[PDB]
């Protein structure tokens, strides 16, 4: 039915784009489909959903969901800062570009000089800090998303378990796939439609909120 009737949810989705100039930019391959799916499931279950979307070209805005379109990592951060205080749940599913062009050309660049890169702020960490400082009373649950690959140093779960504690979020969605909770619970995420996966994620949020 409607688990999320009283829940104000803030969802980010898609990838950000950091401009070199008006024409070109630095981006990633994020579709934002998973975040959109989570947005729809939440709204279907009675949540008041605000969705902040990055590069989602062919996706259609979900009905019953307040849409806030942004372009870059900075624009995303400012959007979150604006809408977070009213949110009970923050679903950080956007693929934020780690690096940004240090200087942006006013006009399209016409061998060229190298591009200087500067690190972007950790928007999630900003939210986690704000709640820790008592500046987010309404916030009850914070969800992070991560893509992990096995390397010589460790397993996928090995890296996933580490990132969950580093980010300081309550739940981490890892892509098969995993749902990692801060209490120490681990649930497998079987390959399926983005809809079914969204249901699993929202179920974890619901289950978490009951414990809150
Ligand atoms: N600048 C950033 C980068 C990440 N994220 C959020 O943090 C979570 C972790 O994403 P990930 O890129 O895997 O974490 P990183 O800190 O960037 O780790 P890594 O350097 O391995 O990519 C994601 O939900 C993402 O939305 C964020 O808010 N701000
Ligand atoms: Mg990153």
Brief write-up:
The protein is 30% helix and 23% strand. The protein has 212 residues and is an alpha/beta fold.
Give an overview of the whole structure.
This is Coenzyme A biosynthesis bifunctional protein CoaBC. GO terms for molecular function: FMN binding; metal ion binding; phosphopantothenate--cysteine ligase activity; phosphopantothenoylcysteine decarboxylase activity. With 212 residues, the chain is α/β, with parallel strands linked by helices. The protein has helices spanning 33-44, 73-83, 123-132, 156-167, 194-211, and strands at 8-13, 18-19, 25-26, 48-53, 65-69, 89-92, 99-101, 117-119, 141-146, 171-174, 178-181, 186-188. The protein is globular and about 60 Å long. It starts with 7 loop residues before the first strand and ends with a helix. The site of cytidine-5'-triphosphate has 12 residues, from helix 3 and strand 9.
**How many strands?**
12
Report the span from N to C terminus.
20 Å
Which outline best applies? globular
CATH topology call? Rossmann fold
Q: Compute the gyration radius: what is it?
A: 18 Å
DSSP helical segment count: 5
């Amino acid at each position: 039915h409607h688990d999320m009737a009283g829940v104000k949810a803030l969802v980010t989705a898609g990838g950000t784009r950091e401009p070199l100039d008006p024409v070109r930019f630095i981006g990633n391959r994020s579709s934002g489909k998973q975040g959109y799916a989570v947005a729809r499931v939440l709204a279907q279950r009675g949540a008041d959903v605000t969705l902040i979307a990055g590069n989602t070209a062919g996706l259609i805005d979900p009905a019953g969901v307040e849409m806030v379109h942004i372009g870059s990592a900075t624009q995303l951060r400012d959007a979150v800062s604006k809408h977070a205080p009213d949110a009970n749940v923050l679903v950080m599913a956007a693929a934020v570009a780690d690096f940004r062009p240090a200087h942006v050309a006013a006009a399209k660049i016409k061998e060229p000089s190298s591009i200087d890169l500067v690190r972007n702020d950790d928007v999630l960490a900003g939210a986690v800090r704000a709640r820790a400082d008592g500046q987010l009373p309404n916030m009850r649950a914070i969800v992070g998303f991560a893509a992990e690959t096995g390397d010589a140093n460790g397993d996928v779960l090995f890296h996933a378990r580490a990132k969950l504690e580093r980010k300081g979020c309550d739940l981490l969605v890892v892509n098969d796939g995993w749902l990692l909770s801060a209490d120490g619970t681990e649930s497998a995420l079987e390959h399926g439609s983005k809809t079914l996966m969204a249901t699993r994620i929202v179920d974890s949020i619901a289950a978490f909120l009951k414990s809150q």
